Amino acid sequence: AVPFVEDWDLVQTLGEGAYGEVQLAVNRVTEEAVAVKIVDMKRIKKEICINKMLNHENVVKFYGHRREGNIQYLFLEYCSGGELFDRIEPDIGMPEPDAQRFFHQLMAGVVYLHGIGITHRDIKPENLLLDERDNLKISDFGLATVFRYNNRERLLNKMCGTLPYVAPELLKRREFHAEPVDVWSCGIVLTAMLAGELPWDQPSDSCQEYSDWKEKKTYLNPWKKIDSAPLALLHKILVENPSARITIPDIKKDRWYNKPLKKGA
Numbered sequence: 001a002v003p004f005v006e007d008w009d010l011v012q013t014l015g016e017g018a019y020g021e022v023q024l025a026v027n028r029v030t031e032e033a034v035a036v037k038i039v040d041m042k043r044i045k046k047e048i049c050i051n052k053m054l055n056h057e058n059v060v061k062f063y064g065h066r067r068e069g070n071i072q073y074l075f076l077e078y079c080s081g082g083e084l085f086d087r088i089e090p091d092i093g094m095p096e097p098d099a100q101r102f103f104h105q106l107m108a109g110v111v112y113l114h115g116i117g118i119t120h121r122d123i124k125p126e127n128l129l130l131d132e133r134d135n136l137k138i139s140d141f142g143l144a145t146v147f148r149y150n151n152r153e154r155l156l157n158k159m160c161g162t163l164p165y166v167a168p169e170l171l172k173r174r175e176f177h178a179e180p181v182d183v184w185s186c187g188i189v190l191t192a193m194l195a196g197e198l199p200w201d202q203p204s205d206s207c208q209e210y211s212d213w214k215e216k217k218t219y220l221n222p223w224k225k226i227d228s229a230p231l232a233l234l235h236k237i238l239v240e241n242p243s244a245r246i247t248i249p250d251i252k253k254d255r256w257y258n259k260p261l262k263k264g265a
């Protein structure tokens, strides 16, 4: 019934991703905003697929796809808060309570994804978007994949993600469980929120700072910035053996996880 309701003005670049660009579009009638992620197939059927499965307040909403010959357009929730990456001040981090709130929302979203059998595989502050109220949303299912189907797990073997965030089993083992990889990467992001710095270049036995963590020398950065409650949680998440690593139901019971810290909005 409504005429030009389907015209959007491309208003500005939001981020020029590796595969193309995302542009803030705005509806000319309604003034609705959306990010339109632009992928030129000639330079994704899975990313569209996984996106159609998803519905949850801490996951970026996907509205639809315009096909346009070669240019793939993906029509996604606009988060005017930008990326979490930007609320982490270098060498400092952010207030404990802001962190603990963003960590509760990250867990929520991750519980939502594992429970529908999807693994995101690239969790990091650049992929954690914040709306106008400062609600966290998990973004970008470009690297993600299925790890339970018809209620049977499959082990992963493809190496992916982003080295400083990646679990150590994925560098040492041919095959590994999906869910401890995401947990692990959640703890790297926590460590960043609380110290403003990343602990190691990669979780290799050839990485001095990683050997230091494994040795427990927490009198060094970034751990000295951290504080015994959160850090105790981090001692359970960054455990090298993925079978011994804390799981999400157990992070929900953790003492700092349940510590009152913040006065509501």
Ligand SMILES: c1ccc2[nH]c(-c3n[nH]c4ccccc34)nc2c1
Binding pocket: 014, 015, 022, 035, 037, 060, 076, 077, 078, 079, 080, 081, 082, 083, 129, 139
């Ligand atoms: C400020 C700066 C960059 C931003 N990127 C978004 C954004 N929302 N939805 C997306 C979906 C995919 C990629 C980016 C986004 N909002 C921003 C606000």
